[PDB]
Design an enzyme around this catalytic site. Structure first.
Site, PDB file in Angstrom:
ATOM      1  N   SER A 134       0.853  -1.196   0.000  1.00 56.88           N
ATOM      2  CA  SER A 134       0.000   0.000   0.000  1.00 56.88           C
ATOM      3  C   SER A 134       0.880   1.234   0.000  1.00 56.88           C
ATOM      4  CB  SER A 134      -0.865   0.045   1.274  1.00 56.88           C
ATOM      5  OG  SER A 134      -1.605  -1.153   1.435  1.00 56.88           O
ATOM      6  N   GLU A 174      -4.245   6.608  -2.115  1.00 60.45           N
ATOM      7  CA  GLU A 174      -3.717   5.263  -2.092  1.00 60.45           C
ATOM      8  C   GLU A 174      -3.460   4.612  -3.441  1.00 60.45           C
ATOM      9  OE1 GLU A 174      -5.284   2.578   0.583  1.00 60.45           O
ATOM     10  OE2 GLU A 174      -4.058   0.922  -0.282  1.00 60.45           O
TER      11      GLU A 174
END
Ligand SMILES: [Hg+2]
Length: 207
Positions: A134, A174
């Site tokens: 991530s 993200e």
């Protein structure tokens, strides 16, 4: 030098924009979008089982093996137009069990002795990550408190998807990266603060 240029998003709206324009051209199945959403509400739980059994899913519960397969699949559609730089935040346990309670003095400042132990253990070496990675398009505030800051350099055409909207439970700006990725730590220096370590990795691909 014979160094290549990477786009670094210097403004949130510029990232949010380039970001959403990439979400369009993906065309993800309904099936995947729920694997990504479940992945944001369970990122901790899944990557933990991934680093663990070193990539093997043939022991994972049914529910999981499917999701894992679906996440992998999604990356056939999410690549990146041009070279980009991504930002990640990590706690001390990232560098090793030994840096857990050694890296930072109770003053919050980084310990220059443990810092060198790390610099020697990782600099100019390749690391291999078994779980997904991530990251954020910028050094968003959900890092900034974190003592380690990695800066990934991803090459044109590599799997990287802006999943910010796909999951409401996805961090700010993200950007997901494929599991089993391998990057090369090319630089380590302390922030011009005292508390952090600014790593400069170079991604290469996922096997
Ligand atoms: Hg980005």
């Amino acid at each position: 030098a014979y160094s290549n240029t990477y786009q670094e998003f210097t403004n949130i709206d510029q990232a949010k924009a380039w970001g959403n324009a990439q979400y369009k051209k993906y065309g993800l199945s309904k099936s995947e979008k729920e694997a990504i959403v479940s992945y944001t509400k369970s990122a901790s739980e899944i990557n933990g089982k991934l680093r663990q059994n070193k990539g093997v899913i043939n022991g994972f519960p049914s529910n999981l093996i499917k999701q894992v397969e679906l996440l992998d699949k999604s990356f056939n559609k999410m690549k990146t137009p041009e070279n980009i730089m991504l930002f990640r935040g990590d706690d001390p346990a990232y560098l090793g069990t030994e840096f857990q309670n050694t890296l930072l003095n109770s003053n919050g400042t980084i310990n220059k002795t443990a810092f060198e132990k790390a610099k020697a253990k990782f600099l100019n070496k390749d690391r291999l990550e078994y779980g997904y990675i991530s990251t954020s398009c910028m050094n968003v505030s959900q890092f900034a408190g974190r003592p380690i800051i990695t800066k990934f350099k991803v090459a044109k055409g590599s799997k990287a998807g802006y999943i910010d909207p796909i999951s409401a439970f996805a961090g700010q700006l993200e950007m997901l990266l494929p599991r089993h990725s391998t990057y090369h730590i090319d630089d380590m220096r302390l922030s011009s603060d005292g508390k952090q370590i600014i790593i400069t990795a170079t991604m290469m691909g996922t096997a």
